[PDB]
Structure formats: structure tokens, C-alpha cells
């Protein structure tokens, strides 16, 4: 007769990831590459968001 023994699939080997273009460049160069840094009592906090 006929007998259903196993199941056939195709296991994948590679994975792909797609995301949209990286756009909103965070302010870092204005902090680490800044020309002037404030005194140690007028400390510079800059908010990055």
C-alpha cells in the first residue's frame, strides 16, 4: 500500500535582515570633537534625543 512516513521541508541556511536607512545622526561630534569645554563648575550637559 501507500504510507505517509515523514514530512518534507526545506531548511534555510542564510538569514537576511532589512531595515530603513540610518538617518537621525546623534550629536556626538559636537561633544567629543568640540573646540571648547566648559569649566569644572559650569559643567556642560547636552541632551541627546
Amino acid at each position, epitope marked *: 500500500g501507500i504510507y505517509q512516513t515523514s514530512n518534507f521541508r526545506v531548511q534555510p541556511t542564510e538569514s537576511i535582515v532589512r531595515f530603513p536607512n540610518i538617518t537621525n545622526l546623534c550629536p556626538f561630534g559636537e561633544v567629543f570633537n568640540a573646540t*571648547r569645554f*566648559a*569649566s569644572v563648575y*559650569a559643567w*556642560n550637559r547636552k541632551r541627546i534625543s
Partner: nanobody, 115 residues
Framework: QVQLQESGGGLVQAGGSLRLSCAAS????????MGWFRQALGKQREMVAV???????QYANFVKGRFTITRDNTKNTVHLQMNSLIPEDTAVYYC?????????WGQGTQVTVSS
């Protein structure tokens, strides 16, 4: 662009009087501190005086009881009364806004006293 205008120096004989002025424009958030600093050719910045938002006045021991700072709240300006001058005071001065962020210095006022 925070800009501070300096005025009121020049040539004065020994014993004369002058009135310097720094007027501040730009951001200059409310808790600011206006100071004045000395430099003669051959020396570094010598701290002369300081006024904060508290209106407290601070002066160095070099010129005890001779110079004064006046504070104008309406225009947020500063006037330094230079009285009882002595040729040891021959030095260009610069004023300094501590503020809360990037600091800004002056363009200079030539103060000369000799006989």
C-alpha cells in the same frame, strides 16, 4: 552668538578715574556671572573682580577698596568704576561671562596710568 561689548578705557594720569562697561547680548541665561580679569604684557590673566546674579561683589587683594562693579538689571549690563589709579594697574582687561554653558571673553580695553 553671545557678544559682550567693552568700553571706557584709555590714557589717564595717576590718580584719575574711569568707567569701563561690558554690555552682554545673545543667550546669557538668567543665572549669569560677570567677571573682570587683568593682563599686563608679560603676565597671564589676573582675576580682578566678579559679580553673580545674587548681586554679591568680589574683589581681589591687589586693588583693595579701589575698584567697584555696578550691575544693571534692566539691560543686564556691568560697569566697572576704576578709581584711585596707580601705574601698577597698567594692564588690558577682559570681561568673562560664566553663564551656564560656553564661556565668552572680551575684545579688550586699554587702561594706562603713568606720569
Amino acid at each position: 552668538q553671545v557678544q559682550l561689548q567693552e568700553s571706557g578705557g584709555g590714557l589717564v594720569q595717576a590718580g584719575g578715574s574711569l568707567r569701563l562697561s561690558c554690555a552682554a547680548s545673545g543667550s546669557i541665561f538668567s543665572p549669569n556671572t560677570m567677571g573682570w580679569f587683568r593682563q599686563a604684557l608679560g603676565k597671564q590673566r589676573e582675576m580682578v573682580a566678579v559679580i553673580s546674579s545674587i548681586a554679591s561683589t568680589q574683589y581681589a587683594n591687589f586693588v583693595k577698596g579701589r575698584f567697584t562693579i555696578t550691575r544693571d538689571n534692566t539691560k543686564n549690563t556691568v560697569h566697572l568704576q576704576m578709581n584711585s589709579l596707580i601705574p601698577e594697574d597698567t594692564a588690558v582687561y577682559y570681561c568673562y561671562a560664566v553663564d551656564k554653558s560656553q564661556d565668552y571673553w572680551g575684545q579688550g580695553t586699554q587702561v594706562t596710568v603713568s606720569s
